């Protein structure tokens with residue numbers, strides 16, 4: 001997971017939103033030791049979400065847990081803290097994480 | 105208290121006398137074929153190159169060299185036994201060669 | 209590649225002669241005498257081959273050279 | 287002493303010959319059948335009066351006898367019933383079993399035995415290494431205090447526990463009168479017991495075990511020999527291997543050398559160190575241990591494991607002191623990831639809420655543990671929220687309210703911690 005290559009390089013997510021996608025992936029997996037500044041733990045979390053080592057029954061990967069996230073509150077907090085309009089970007093990240101480079 | 109009692113080691117000479125009987129009973133070549141072949145080629149290189157050496161010529165050379173070395177060690181063993189020793193030394197080798205006429 | 213005549217091999221060769229103990233300095237001496245003997249026989253075989261107008265040394269040249277040195281070898285077409 | 291021969295025999299299944307787990311084990315030359323079996327050149331020497339073939343005797347020049355190989359009938363020139371068939375003919379020396387003062391049953395010579403004479407063939411089941419390991423684990427679970435294994439050769443052992451012969455009762459002597467030797471009988475290997483010297487009637491027959499413990503603990507030797515080393519095993523061991531568990535010891539900065547040094551300095555100089563057991567912590571070792579700052583994250587994980595495991599006051603004191611020496615921020619971030627605050631809450635609680643110690647010493651502990659809490663980098667109360675250690679701090683400042691420096695330090699600490707925000711965590715659907 002710490003390697004030179006990146007999971008999100010095979011998706012439509014821009015590199016400026018890679019930490020946003022990794023924070024979504026880490027918060028979706030119910031991790032609590034995670035800190036925003038720790039990029040390594042973010043990469044481990046997104047790697048275990050997209051390529052789990054022990055997937056559950058009839059599930060290829062843990063991407064289905066993203067549907068429990070409340071993206072609206074996350075977009076509201078992003079707009080409050082950083083003055084970024086990213087409401088559609090969270091949806092695009094979610095769709096790309098669930099299926100990397102669909103046929104549109 | 106699950107330890108194991110060790111069988112200890114043999115006296116110096118017992119395994120020597122065993123392997124003496126074993127090698128004096130069997131007749132295979134004792135020098136490895138490929139290093140001897142390389143050595144013969146290295147010696148032959150000094151006179152004129154591009155000299156091919158049939159496998160039968162190398163085998164005949166190996167047999168003659170082994171016979172010569174075995175005879176020399178028998179004579180050197182007689183020399184060592186004569187000097188009330190059981191270990192052969194280079195001085196016995198030189199003396200055996202001297203009396204044989206090989207060394208001037 | 210004179211070091212190719214390894215220490216267990218020369219130990220085995222001494223063991224066939226009935227030798228019980230081996231000095232640590234003897235191995236270089238045996239390598240030297242083996243080199244001298246091989247040098248002489250190889251030289252004689254090479255000049256035999258050169259007289260025979262050939263480019264490949266055959267077993268007959270080797271057996272000839274050895275028999276000319278009083279070390280007649282049986283079993284190789286002599 | 288009264289004879290115990292039949293009583294000793296009833297304790298196990300008596301064997302007349304070695305049994306094999308399989309036909310491949312125990313074969314001579316690693317199973318390479320020497321079809322040209324080693325035939326002695328001895329001429330058969332038949333005494334016409336007794337009709338006994340005296341060939342291959344003790345003072346004869348039988349090469350096979352010298353090389354510790356037995357003649358086989360129908361293959362050797364010595365003929366049948368030569369004097370080098372001691373194993374096969376089972377011509378054991380006469381022996382008896384007597385109860386010793388401390389060693390249990392022991393073997394004694396019923397008759398005077400000459401030098402180099404064959405005493406008795408060690409008998410047992412020939413087994414492989416895996417079978418040996420399984421049986422060893424089973425016997426150690428059974429608590430057996432007696433060795434019954436001998437190494438026939440590499441990967442091949444002989445077990446004398448359930449089945450064997452009288453030779454299993456021979457006791458170790460550091461100056462033994464007998465010795466075990468390895469011989470070749472046909473295409474098989476045997477282990478015999480021979481007389482090292484002249485032995486008189488009634489004397490005990492003993493041999494040097496040369497124990498390979500395979501990590502087992504030393505057993506004290508009560509042979510009574512003046513040259514006794516005091517323990518079974520040519521493997522200096524004593525207790526210079528572990529005093530505390532490996533993660534806990536490495537958490538304190540101790541290693542195999544530091545665990546060696548303490549025991550070597552005191553136990554060898556007439557001062558008591560208990561047998562290896564981590565249920566009881568030796569406070570003196572922990573106090574005397576040297577402390578160096580931590581700069582490795584695996585060592586931090588071992589420290590966290592030690593905090594989660596060890597209950598001792600002194601080990602926690604020295605770990606906290608080592609953390610005080612430690613100032614690498616990355617190791618501290620790892621400890622935060624490991625939730626060191628959670629462990630430090632319990633470490634506090636056990637000492638300054640439960641009271642197994644003295645108030646002054648507990649005060650010194652609290653002053654020695656507040657400092658690194660004040661010093662570690664912190665950026666968000668999400669870190670503390672994984673422990674709620676602030677609650678423990680309030681409880682202990684309220685309990686020890688008379689000790690005002692602790693209260694003021696905890697005031698400063700909670701004031702500093704309250705300035706931190708909380709890391710945002712995305713709400714999940716319900």
Ligand SMILES: Nc1ncnc2c1ncn2[C@@H]1O[C@H](CSCC[C@H](N)C(=O)O)[C@@H](O)[C@H]1O
Pocket residue numbers: 105388389390391392431432433434454455456457458459505506507508509510
């Ligand atoms: N000199 C000695 N002092 C104390 N125990 C001894 C000893 N020699 C041998 N032993 C013990 O005896 C074991 C070997 S089996 C020997 C027979 C058995 N002890 C019995 O009396 O039935 C060893 O494991 C060792 O623990």
Ligand SMILES: [Zn+2]
Pocket residue numbers: 326327328341342348349350351357364370
């Ligand atoms: Zn014999």
Ligand SMILES: [Zn+2]
Pocket residue numbers: 326328341342348357358362364365368369370
């Ligand atoms: Zn015999």
Ligand SMILES: [Zn+2]
Pocket residue numbers: 459460507508509510511513514515516517
């Ligand atoms: Zn002893």
